[PDB]
Amino acid sequence: LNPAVAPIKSIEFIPVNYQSQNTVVVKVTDENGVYGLGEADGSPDAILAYANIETEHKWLTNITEKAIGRLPIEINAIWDAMYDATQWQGMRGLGMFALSGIDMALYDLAGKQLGVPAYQLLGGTNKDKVHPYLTLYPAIPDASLDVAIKGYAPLLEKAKAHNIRAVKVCVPIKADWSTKEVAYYLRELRGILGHDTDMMVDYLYRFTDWYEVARLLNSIEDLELYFAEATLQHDDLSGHAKLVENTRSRICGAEMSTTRFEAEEWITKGKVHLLQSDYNRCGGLTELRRITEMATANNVQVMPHNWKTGITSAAAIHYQFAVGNAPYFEYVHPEFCDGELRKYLVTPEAELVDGGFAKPTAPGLGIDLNQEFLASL
Amino acid sequence: SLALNPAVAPIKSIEFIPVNYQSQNTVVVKVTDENGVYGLGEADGSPDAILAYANIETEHKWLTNITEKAIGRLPIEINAIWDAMYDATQWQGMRGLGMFALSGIDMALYDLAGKQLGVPAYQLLGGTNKDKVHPYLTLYPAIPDASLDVAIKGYAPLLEKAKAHNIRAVKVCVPIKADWSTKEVAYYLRELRGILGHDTDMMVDYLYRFTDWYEVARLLNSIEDLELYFAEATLQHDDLSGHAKLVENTRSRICGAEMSTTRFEAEEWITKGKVHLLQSDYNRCGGLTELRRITEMATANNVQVMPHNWKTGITSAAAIHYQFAVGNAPYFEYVHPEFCDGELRKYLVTPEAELVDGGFAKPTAPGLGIDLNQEFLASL
Amino acid sequence: SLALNPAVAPIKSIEFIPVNYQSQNTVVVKVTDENGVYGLGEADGSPDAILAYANIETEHKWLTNITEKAIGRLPIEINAIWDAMYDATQWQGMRGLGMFALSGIDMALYDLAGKQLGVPAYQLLGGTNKDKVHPYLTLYPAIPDASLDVAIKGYAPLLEKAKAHNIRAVKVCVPIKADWSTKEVAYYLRELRGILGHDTDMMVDYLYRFTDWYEVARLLNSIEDLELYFAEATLQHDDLSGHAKLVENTRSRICGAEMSTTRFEAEEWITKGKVHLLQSDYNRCGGLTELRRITEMATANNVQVMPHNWKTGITSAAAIHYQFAVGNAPYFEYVHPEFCDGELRKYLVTPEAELVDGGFAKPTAPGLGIDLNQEFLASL
Amino acid sequence: LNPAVAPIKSIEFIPVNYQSQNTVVVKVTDENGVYGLGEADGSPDAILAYANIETEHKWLTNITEKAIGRLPIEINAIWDAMYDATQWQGMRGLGMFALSGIDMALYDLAGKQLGVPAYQLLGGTNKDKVHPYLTLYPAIPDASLDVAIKGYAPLLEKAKAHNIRAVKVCVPIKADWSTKEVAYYLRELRGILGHDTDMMVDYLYRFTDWYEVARLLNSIEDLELYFAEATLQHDDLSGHAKLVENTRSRICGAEMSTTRFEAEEWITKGKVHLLQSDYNRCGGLTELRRITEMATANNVQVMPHNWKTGITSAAAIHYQFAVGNAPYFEYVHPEFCDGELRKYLVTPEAELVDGGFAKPTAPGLGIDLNQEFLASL
Numbered sequence A, D: 001l002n003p004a005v006a007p008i009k010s011i012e013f014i015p016v017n018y019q020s021q022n023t024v025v026v027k028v029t030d031e032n033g034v035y036g037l038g039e040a041d042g043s044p045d046a047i048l049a050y051a052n053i054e055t056e057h058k059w060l061t062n063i064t065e066k067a068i069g070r071l072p073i074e075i076n077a078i079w080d081a082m083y084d085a086t087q088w089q090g091m092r093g094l095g096m097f098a099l100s101g102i103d104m105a106l107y108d109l110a111g112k113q114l115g116v117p118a119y120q121l122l123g124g125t126n127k128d129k130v131h132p133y134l135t136l137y138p139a140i141p142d143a144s145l146d147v148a149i150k151g152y153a154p155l156l157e158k159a160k161a162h163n164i165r166a167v168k169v170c171v172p173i174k175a176d177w178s179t180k181e182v183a184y185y186l187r188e189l190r191g192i193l194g195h196d197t198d199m200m201v202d203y204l205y206r207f208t209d210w211y212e213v214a215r216l217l218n219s220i221e222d223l224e225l226y227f228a229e230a231t232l233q234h235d236d237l238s239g240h241a242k243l244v245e246n247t248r249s250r251i252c253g254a255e256m257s258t259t260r261f262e263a264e265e266w267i268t269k270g271k272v273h274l275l276q277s278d279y280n281r282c283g284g285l286t287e288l289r290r291i292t293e294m295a296t297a298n299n300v301q302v303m304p305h306n307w308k309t310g311i312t313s314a315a316a317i318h319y320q321f322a323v324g325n326a327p328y329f330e331y332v333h334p335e336f337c338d339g340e341l342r343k344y345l346v347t348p349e350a351e352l353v354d355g356g357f358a359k360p361t362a363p364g365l366g367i368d369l370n371q372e373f374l375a376s377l
Numbered sequence B, C: 001s002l003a004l005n006p007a008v009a010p011i012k013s014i015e016f017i018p019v020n021y022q023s024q025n026t027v028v029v030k031v032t033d034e035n036g037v038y039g040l041g042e043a044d045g046s047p048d049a050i051l052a053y054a055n056i057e058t059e060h061k062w063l064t065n066i067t068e069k070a071i072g073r074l075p076i077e078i079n080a081i082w083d084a085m086y087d088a089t090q091w092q093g094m095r096g097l098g099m100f101a102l103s104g105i106d107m108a109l110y111d112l113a114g115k116q117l118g119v120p121a122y123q124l125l126g127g128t129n130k131d132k133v134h135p136y137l138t139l140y141p142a143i144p145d146a147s148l149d150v151a152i153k154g155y156a157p158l159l160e161k162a163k164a165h166n167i168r169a170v171k172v173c174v175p176i177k178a179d180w181s182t183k184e185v186a187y188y189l190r191e192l193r194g195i196l197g198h199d200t201d202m203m204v205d206y207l208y209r210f211t212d213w214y215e216v217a218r219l220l221n222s223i224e225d226l227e228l229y230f231a232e233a234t235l236q237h238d239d240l241s242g243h244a245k246l247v248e249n250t251r252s253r254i255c256g257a258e259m260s261t262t263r264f265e266a267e268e269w270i271t272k273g274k275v276h277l278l279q280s281d282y283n284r285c286g287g288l289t290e291l292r293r294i295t296e297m298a299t300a301n302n303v304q305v306m307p308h309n310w311k312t313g314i315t316s317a318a319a320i321h322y323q324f325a326v327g328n329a330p331y332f333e334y335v336h337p338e339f340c341d342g343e344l345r346k347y348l349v350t351p352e353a354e355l356v357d358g359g360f361a362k363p364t365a366p367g368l369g370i371d372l373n374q375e376f377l378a379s380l
Ligand SMILES: [Mg+2]
Pocket: A202, A229, A230, A255
């Protein structure tokens, strides 16, 4: 057998704060010193504590215990083991963020051992390139319609200049615009962007009444927006079904969810067009694979939520090549987003050429920490 | 014009206190108002994971420290505060561990609000028309997992003791590591039922040892004659469709939601799981406030609620108040000192409700009628 | 051991007081405790029919005098008392007039319980996270039923006045005896909408003038451009299947349950009527206690609740407290003195909530913050 | 990268007949001479002709064409590429058997290149041992009850002696026994075997009326059989549903089906408790993985049909370890079967101990052709 396939020796959770952007790097190392990198969402110190709890019983075990000593190649089996041993407090919520980080690191570690890029461990690909949609947000107050539009105007011009195939814009949380003003706002941005680029919208959960949201969405149908994200409260699945039944917009769901079980509910009860389960929240690449194959059979697209560091971004590219079932996937690019962690935490940076990425050639996720940057916090 | 109650003072601080005993542990939640008056509650989950969660730093609209939205609020507005805490913590507290922390605070608010207004907690949940409540007691002997004869011999004295004290209902378990075939489990339960007799209701906890509904159905159907009250933790907790199969192909009461959180998961168990009874826990699912919503919803759908309960006397006190004002079933889970091992359960708080003839009388003290036994607590 | 609140005293008597004005009438319900402290509420229905109902003689388990089960109970146990009264009166009070009487008592309990504990009523319903609430005002000019030009001319000054006072939303009605064709109704509403402008939400009450859903659908669909908030009393109140048709074939919000009683009828409107909004009345459907259950149920099903409200300042006070702690919609029905005729509505009780910029601030007085204006009341 | 992961160079379909019994071996060789073995069901000559057709258009392509030149590690991608290019005549039926053989062979090849057993390429395992059910059938005339019961007698006893945990008996096709006689037959067999060993029953499609079958199955509920296979005609899904709705027996389906699309129908329309899609018919291990994960979500067990040579039997052991969701799986063992082909075609044979198999250790499927036996034609 392949000697490089060695059992996991250790797994450490490494908080990384930068003055308030942060993440929790997950490092899994085998007995030969080779290691994989992943990252978990959630308050770094809460995640670190959870990752260091004492095992108490069958359903309340330390998350890393079931992985240490196992062969990194058995990613599916290791996932089941960790999940089963942590049911008392990790079936949903924060605990799943920790499991995600480990699952992610395993694809990077397994890739290095076998000498293959992570997407080849996920089924391989028939695509020659993938194209992300970029989430854009200017450094604005929440501001006024004028400030917001002026702040977006250039990011949108820059996107078109770079031939980005799709972009997502947001409605400022603290903004107090009426739905009539939101429509105007979106019309103005779409006016700036043009119709050759797909445009997604994140309403940041500013609504609670499906009826009002339906009136808004049905009034801007002419804008041919790609989707409507975070319209109603995340727990309001029946409310989302109402939107699907009464509008012609693509309705998204599950951005903050965890596991395929919550994903299944969004599909059947929420009737949503697209799931946004996050790499570093819902159960990693392994759970996103099950979620996506289930989604496909149900005519539901999956565009995993993504706004962390270069670690998740790398996982995102690999996901899109072997698992993705949609035209785009969420990605945060350094030239279209402020944030040092995203910018320098890991290297190298995937090269975006004409709005797309080429197939990964390096082992695993093809990334490593920028010791220099990390050396300074 | 009439002046308002002076005792209804703003909350000044919220403290999470982990308590381990050498294992046995819990997380005491103490909410103190402007005048030094306080309420006690407790949260499930690894005490140190919970402690760290309770001390995180606020980052944005949906990622706030759980206590932040409670500080400065009047303890009497429990429902509003619950919503304030939930909304501000959606990023990592909608489900799982995070809800355990919110649960502990909610529980404490009933105790505190009760003291400020000078009324027992159940009167803040609607009052009661019951004069007494009767819990079912969960029994488990000290047996190594053990074998058939070993397990039966170990349960025997507990079952006789319960009959002697007139306990109206008890729950027995199938040991986790026991490798008994389904037929041996059937034998096992027949033996226990035989020892106990049929005047006492018997619930059974299978400790999630099954994954195939058909096998489980064959089991439960083979023991209808035992007239067991319910079948708990038969299939894996995520297998809601599997529970539905059980309900559709057997005549046993099927339970669910013991490890769940929030009324949203509870609703799914009701509609998709089709279960006859929900076991959402006081210190996990959202405290008494969420249990009230879950129970009123459960009643409308002909579903009983018997909250999971295996912590300290803090949750036990909450359970009695719950059963008097909210409970919609004949029994509710309760762990009694004389019927279990657990120094933490026996000594952490005082006083202890007096079980008379297998029932509890209406609580009379303000709030949850409990307090920390500092000597025990100080003894480490 | 801590002593309980002394102010929480048993209820000693319950009195129903009919009040007519020459027509305008109501039934004041006064609940007095051991120490003379009392709460006010009011019941809908013919005052003399209600009076007689409130004084019937107990005959058997299900045919009891409504007050009997409340007398001797601590006002703080509102939910338990509600169940006690309901269960004992099933023979003739489960629906209809009988529930009006129960509603009045429940409302009074919030006022009384509030005074004993020294807290505003909304704090007994869970508190609030809102700083202000905004009602919609129902407008109707003095017009004989009138004709198109007559009705429009009459509504004009009311609509301008509302805009001047910054009322966030208003409701207009289609006169009952008006024989306008559906096309004339469409014209009518277009005119009113034109006068009002689009910054103020406009609700429409059709006063049950229709019986054919298809005709109604054609109407509502022809006026989508008016962006009306909702369509109330379109089809007959018993026609739940007809409302479903409307919801399925139009894009207007369809209301229901304005004249209904209990959460059981409310549930049917939700599931069978498929309505977007319930209008169960404070003084008809079961008071604030039942409105709380109906609203929490409505929210889970994405249904708004704007309780019907057209009585005296007693229900108006209840409405504000309701909206702060229970309401799940942007507005709620309210009748304001400066926007209506009604000596009973204007003078029966004091003080009057101050509408500032079309909104109400948090109530501060105990209970419902109201009391009988004996001079007015004494003046017959 | 990993030098061993080389492009596929050729794919050969080799008919194997015995003087009756036959199969079609599938040999996929990479650019280094390393190869993987697999087998396809169906008339060997029909299959060979199908594997040698000429590409005509987008949807009518030679099955091997989309695999040649591809890295065998990208099994999921190759599966899609082959399926997509052969839709015109390979979406269902015979065509899928061929695709199945190639898919199976890719797991063996990919396992050899990476130097890991096939099951690790399917997720790994947390099971230490797997236990098959053995399909038994005596060499009997169709015969009378007595004769049939007599033939099964020794086999049953031998099964108990070898501690086989589960066995499947069949009702002779040409047997003209009434439903009452079939019931007597099964009672007699259950008596001989005992209840400590699970017993499955294959009725070989002798019924067409669900009502009659329900009566039979409801009358032998006391025998507590594990399942009822091939009761009604294979196209009669609505009929299987009536069986499920009116009896308490586990009802099987999909034995002769292909693709996860037919399997989904069996689950939702047929309401069956267990699927029997075959490794060498339905789309191979890749499709069995999708079918099983879908089945698990629907509380449906999967025990893939298996009656070919040691090539499929090997694939079956690996399947059960990493993908299987049921306590047993079909297996044909040489000491319990009478097939020269099943015994000699490939080596080595997995060791059955106390009714179970240990985790495979050799790369890929761990089998190879027995040249001598083959040279014997
Ligand atoms: Mg978002």
